Design a protein around this ligand. Structure first.
Ligand SMILES: N[C@@H](CCC(=O)N[C@@H](CS(=O)O)C(=O)NCC(=O)O)C(=O)O
Lengths: 204, 204
């Protein structure tokens, strides 16, 4: 069977968990708990993913896949349902670009979390923090437009990725109050939060 | 024709350029010079690229793709013959994981560069910087121990990504010596550095 390095905070892990739920493949995956940060290595994880990041997926044959987008691609090709990642043509490119937009939000969000929670306050750099927050805000604006119609078309790779990014803002960055100025996105997210796969994968 | 939002220092742009050379698709592309935004997002927007993604690829009919991994997939699917990303088989996820290893080297390398170059010295956090350097070192060790034959077998998505990551280490982090403990990787890099795709795309 498969083994996924996991913890319930990670929104990248959450993408994987949501895809597993949606595709009926939770039964294939043992969870290996990991607590970690860039200054607190997990030695067991590092033996499998030298980058020291989660998610990482150990296959039945012992090979390891990372990062999250590689794992999601692998898992999407294992089931016979409709794919969550379009296999060809225009949709493939469009939906993977929205997924990358969402990953960029997560990347900035995690960096701001680590600076605020781990770095000594006297070493915080406010202009850096605000630059990351502004990159998140600009991406949210594009998502507001996408929430008009494109986002809701399918609960697929793009929708999962965006949903996990918004859930992570709620969890670690409520001060960004993303709903206040993004009502269309707020409505979309309120709906997709009720999906069983989202309810089962919320952070602590 | 296509437009690539381009910067010559970025190793992520470099992967795209190398793949365009290697697949014979430079005759498709016009470059549009674009400024990296390490701290505050750029105040000058191109309306097709409101998030200032670099690389970003604007298709013949105006859709814009990003990030580099999405662009690489798109471009690889636009030519016939030998794909540089395997379409299926164990090799697909093996080569994509090796590419992700390389992207992780680049990610750690950029974080270290931007902190060292842009953040005030008194606010540098050495244990954080070393945690990122340790990702790089562990990843190099995996390449040397596990990936030499793989890299040599095909100058593909994995090899291009690794090559660009090593070029970026030489460019921004020559203090991080990597050739001594990874002699096979060093020899391979010396060889592939002479490919026209690599010579043409070296950072300034
Ligand atoms: N490109 C990767 C990013 C994973 C990541 O940053 N994960 C964080 C945990 S966070 O999501 O809770 C992680 O592993 N941090 C540890 C570290 O950076 O040392 C992916 O898409 O899987």
């Amino acid at each position: 069977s498969l083994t996924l390095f996991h913890n319930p905070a990670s929104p990248y892990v959450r993408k994987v968990m949501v895809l597993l739920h949606e595709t009926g493949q939770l039964n294939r995956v043992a969870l290996q708990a990991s607590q970690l940060s860039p200054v607190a290595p997990d030695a067991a994880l590092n033996q499998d993913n030298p980058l020291g990041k989660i998610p990482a997926l150990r296959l039945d044959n012992g090979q390891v896949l990372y990062d999250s987008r590689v794992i999601l691609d692998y898992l999407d090709q294992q089931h016979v349902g409709n794919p969550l990642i379009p296999r060809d043509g225009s949709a493939r490119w469009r939906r993977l670009t929205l997924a990358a937009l969402a990953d960029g939000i997560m990347d900035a969000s995690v960096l701001v979390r680590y600076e605020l929670a781990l770095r000594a306050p006297e070493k915080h750099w406010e202009q850096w923090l605000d630059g990351q927050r502004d990159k998140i805000r600009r991406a949210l604006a594009v998502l507001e437009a996408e929430a008009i119609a494109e986002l809701a078309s399918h609960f697929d790779i793009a929708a999962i990725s965006v949903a996990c990014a918004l859930g992570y803002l709620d969890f670690r960055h409520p001060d960004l109050e993303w709903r206040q100025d993004h009502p269309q996105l707020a409505a979309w997210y309120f709906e997709i939060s009720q999906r069983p796969s989202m309810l089962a994968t919320r952070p602590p």
